[PDB]
């Protein structure tokens, strides 16, 4: 197994996957690494299993159909994995915890949103459709772009949104387009 967390790239108290060489901090894995379970399989491995069981699941889909899906166990897992892929980028730090807004010439968003809030909402089964999760994720970056206006720091929202969107297309097998 790797000697660093797959998500934050630090050593520490690491749990090792039994079916692949990845390792995790307890609360870096999503869901949080399970108490017992021998053997244990990481989220990467669980996602690969879904694909292998249903190879047609990789055929292209329309985004509108994906968003309307109910959050049954496989869609729950896919959203947890997508969230974890965002935390894998170091730039997620800017979006992880609760923000506050006090900048001359800007007003804070009407509906603040952050990654740890989406993480809690997934854990608490607060989303009934994929659309709820995706809307809160896109709201993070939209709030950031609107608040930071012409400051170059706006770019951090474009960067981490691009990681979200590429992973969304991959994980939910969105039909490739020009
Ligand atoms: Zn970690
Ligand atoms: Zn694994
Ligand atoms: Zn099948």
Burial of 110 (0-12, 13-18, 19+ CB in 10 A): exposed
Residues 83, 10 share a domain: no
Cα-to-centroid distance, 29 and ligand 2 (Å): 11
Same domain membership, residue 66 and residue 30: no
Is the same domain home to 54 and 70? no
CA distance to 44, 63, 128, per residue, from 67 (Å): 22, 6, 11
* Separation in Å, CA 63 to CA 68, 121, 133: 9, 22, 13
Experimental method: X-ray
Same domain, 129 and 86: yes
Q: Are residues 40 and 121 in the same domain?
A: no
At what resolution in Å was this solved? 1.4
The rounded distance, in Å, linking the Cα atoms of 84 and 29 is: 7
Mark whether 82 and 147 lie in a shared domain: yes
CA 35 – ligand 2 centroid, Å: 16
Task: Count structural domains, the chain.
Answer: 2
| Neighbouring residues of the ion ligand 2, judged by CB less than 5 Å | 17, 20, 42, 44-45
Q: Are residues 48 and 82 in the same domain?
A: no
Domain residue limits at 136: 60-178
The ligand placed nearest to the CA atom of residue 42 is 2
Residues 48 and 69 in one domain: no
């Amino acid at each position: 197994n790797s000697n660093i967390c797959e998500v934050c790239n630090k050593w520490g108290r690491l749990f090792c996957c039994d079916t692949c060489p990845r390792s995790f901090h307890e609360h870096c894995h999503i869901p949080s690494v399970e108490a017992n379970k021998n053997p244990w399989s990481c989220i990467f491995c669980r996602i690969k299993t879904i694909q292998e069981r249903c190879p047609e699941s990789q055929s292209g889909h329309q985004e509108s159909e994906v968003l309307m899906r109910q959050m049954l166990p496989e869609e729950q897992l896919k959203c947890e994995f997508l969230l974890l892929k965002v935390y894998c980028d170091s730039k997620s730090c800017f979006f992880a915890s609760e923000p506050y807004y006090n900048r001359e010439g800007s007003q804070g968003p009407q509906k603040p949103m952050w990654l740890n809030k989406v993480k809690t909402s997934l854990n608490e089964q607060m989303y009934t459709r994929v659309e709820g999760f995706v809307q809160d994720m896109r709201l993070i970056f939209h709030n950031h772009k609107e608040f930071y206006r012409e400051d170059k720091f706006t770019r951090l929202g474009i960067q981490v949104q691009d990681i979200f969107e590429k992973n969304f297309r991959n994980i939910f097998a969105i039909q490739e387009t020009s």
